[PDB]
Design a protein around this nucleic acid. Structure first.
Ligand SMILES: [Zn+2]
Length: 660
RNA sequence: UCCAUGCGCAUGACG
RNA sequence: CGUCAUGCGCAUGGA
């Protein structure tokens, strides 16, 4: 169970040597890691000491994979193993699998929450001193406010207390192992910047060395066939809409101060909405919202079939008319805006069918490779989800070769779409592995255990060096067809990825060949520095929220600056959600639902929240994101997008008020 | 297995 | 500091 190249890199770790390890894809780093584990435990048998190993990840899926495939098949006999998650409904808490279970595979924030329970007295606590070893995958996330940097800051604080005792007079601490791919470089154009980054990493891990492979590079090169770095790089309907935009700009005096079809315009639009919410005036924030929609339509039209933007806006104003009618079941402003749209709606639909594109060059390259390969595996990357659905439906519209494809996105329920499911992600992955799905359409979710592939493209994308190497890792089978499709500095960015991959080795070779004294000095300095940083950060955070006012305010709608609620009439449930009972409120809102939690809408048509069902009660839960404040102390209005921004506190709900 | 919500994190681009 | 897009983890309540 030992490889030659793995041997030396394991070698220091076996006796002290809290280290880092970095190797490419496919080197079976899990296997050498397992060897370190088994050897550590056998040493603890020889010493009859507390052999405890905990494995940390960033994602649940790797936990499950390693529990299935790596750790059990080599330690299912000797030792206790268990693979943990946040979702695996565990019958006991964490401190019991600490009291048992020599081997743990788990997500980090599980542990971190347990540590907080320790230092809070919450549920029975747990500390690092309960361990003899820690093992990590993907160290390169180990930066400021990362998932698990907090653990290391605790570890470092305890190390420095140990130093203070040592000079003073020293409790033990666990050995720490770190693994990764290329450890990434962060915000660099300089070798010195990158060296500082790496040293900061190692001090955040309290490492001794990286211990990359140099000796047996040929035997490993024989394993890894590498891909080939390649470049395959390649209206009036739009202008009608730009004319509508200018018309509306004139309609409410809107100075863009920049071009159409970018973020800066969107940024200014949202800032206008903010100012108009500070004002409570219409024609200004409403236009910000509409123009935001139009800019969406623009910067998809730069890349997408115009029919999709027409569908976007058709559904948009459809929902708008639904809102206004459900409320009425109108103003010159909304009337103008609606009629300005609908007077062109059907004609613009007619324009939508016309041809005249990146899409064309794209289809050409696609058909070229699927004719070449003839078993063919294909991946598509891009920025957004709606892009994926649109291209899937579009290629389903386009005939043909007969290649079959499917979309893919993440899981965050944000910003446009009902997200996918982990089960369904695994499902589509198995469909692709089967050959049922020939071509995948994905966001960065792919950059996973996807099958060996050929033609990972970049259709209007930018990625960083870690993402570049992670995209490299999956393209295999002695055929790489890296492709890139953007319009108008994107070669620059793959060039940057190459440059950074060079800089990383240039830095690694300098730091490996460094004094141990000066290395330890700089890492200790960075540790103290980061610890001071975290301390000051916690200081400012505690100083942040101190008000806890029961009621000081009035909540108003944002389209209409109409009163909606008071500071005291609100109540809290789940210590998460907010509600306004006292049906003096209930005389206000209107309900809507189409397709079980119905949504709320205003007396103007403003959407407000959801009717959340809790303990039989159908409580109207609202979102601060769609409301505005008027403080008693301060007249100027404010807007937060989140309750937590507001320091002042509201009470937990008491059902004793609502009986009969 | 699905749904809704809250919170935190990172990344890229943008100012 | 803010915005956007993307991805991730955790905690909830319900079915
Ligand atoms: Zn209103």
């Amino acid at each position: 169970q030992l490889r030659p190249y793995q041997m030396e890199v394991a070698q220091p770790a076996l006796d002290g040597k809290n280290i880092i390890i970095c190797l490419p894809t496919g080197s079976g780093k899990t296997r050498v890691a397992v060897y370190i584990t088994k050897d550590h435990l056998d040493k603890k048998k020889q010493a009859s000491e507390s052999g405890k190993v905990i494995v940390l990840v960033n994602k649940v899926m790797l936990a499950e994979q390693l529990f299935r495939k790596e750790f059990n098949p080599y330690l299912k006999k000797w030792y206790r193993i268990i693979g943990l998650s946040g979702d695996t409904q565990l019958k006991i808490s964490f401190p019991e699998v600490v009291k048992s279970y020599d081997v743990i595979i788990s997500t980090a924030q599980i542990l971190e929450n347990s540590l907080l329970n320790l230092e809070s007295g919450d549920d029975d606590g747990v500390q690092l001193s309960d361990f003899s070893l820690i093992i990590i995958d993907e160290c390169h996330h180990t930066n400021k406010e990362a998932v698990y940097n907090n653990i290391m800051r605790r570890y470092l604080k305890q190390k420095l207390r140990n130093n203070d005792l040592k000079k003073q007079n020293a409790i033990p601490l666990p050995q720490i192992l770190g693994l990764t791919a290329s450890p990434g470089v962060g915000a660099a154009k300089k070798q010195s910047e990158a060296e500082k980054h790496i040293l900061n990493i190692c001090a955040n891990l309290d490492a001794f060395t990286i211990k990359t492979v140099k000796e047996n590079l040929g035997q490993l090169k024989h394993q890894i066939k590498e891909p080939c770095k390649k470049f395959v790089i390649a209206n009036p309907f739009k202008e009608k809409l730009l004319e509508i935009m200018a018309s509306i700009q004139t309609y409410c005096q809107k100075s863009p101060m920049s071009d159409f079809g970018t973020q800066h315009y969107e940024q200014w639009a949202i800032q206008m909405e903010k100012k108009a919410a500070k004002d409570g005036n219409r024609k200004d924030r409403v236009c910000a919202e509409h123009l935001r929609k139009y800019n969406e339509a623009l910067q998809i039209n730069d890349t997408i079939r115009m029919i999709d933007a027409y569908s976007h806006l058709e559904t948009f104003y459809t929902d708008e008319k639904e809102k206004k009618f459900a409320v009425l079941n109108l103003d010159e402003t909304d009337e103008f805006l609606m009629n300005l749209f609908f007077d062109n709606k059907k004609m613009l639909k007619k324009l939508a069918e016309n041809p005249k594109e990146k899409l064309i060059k794209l289809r050409n390259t696609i058909l070229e490779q699927f004719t070449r390969s003839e078993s063919s595996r294909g991946i598509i990357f891009t920025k957004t989800r709606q892009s994926t659905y649109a291209l899937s439906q579009w290629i389903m519209e386009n005939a043909k070769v007969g290649v079959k494809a499917h979309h893919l996105i993440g899981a965050g329920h944000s910003s446009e779409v009902k997200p996918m499911t982990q089960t369904e992600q695994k499902e589509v992955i198995s469909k692709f592995r089967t050959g049922e799905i020939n071509l995948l359409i994905a966001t960065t979710v792919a950059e996973l255990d996807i099958k060996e592939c050929n033609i990972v493209i970049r259709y209007g994308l930018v990625t960083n060096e870690i993402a570049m190497v992670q995209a490299r890792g999956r393209a295999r089978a002695d055929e790489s067809t890296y492709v890139l499709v953007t319009s108008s500095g994107v070669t620059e960015r793959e060039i940057v990825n190459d440059f950074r991959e060079k800089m990383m080795y240039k830095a690694i070779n300098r730091v490996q060949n460094m004094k141990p004294e000066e290395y330890a000095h700089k890492i200790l300095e960075l540790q103290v520095q980061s610890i001071l940083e975290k301390k000051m950060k916690v200081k400012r955070s505690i100083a942040k929220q101190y008000n806890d006012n029961p009621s000081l305010i009035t909540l108003l709608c944002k389209n209409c600056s109409m009163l909606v609620c008071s500071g005291e009439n609100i109540h809290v449930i789940e210590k998460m959600h907010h509600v306004n009972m006292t049906p003096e409120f209930k005389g206000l809102y209107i309900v809507r639902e189409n397709k079980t939690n119905g949504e709320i809408i205003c007396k103007c048509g403003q959407a407000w929240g959801t009717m959340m069902v809790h303990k039989g009660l159908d409580l109207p839960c609202l979102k601060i994101r769609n409301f505005v404040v008027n403080f008693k102390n301060n007249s100027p209005k404010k807007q937060y997008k989140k309750w937590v921004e507001l320091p002042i506190r509201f009470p937990d709900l008491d059902y004793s008020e609502y009986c009969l």
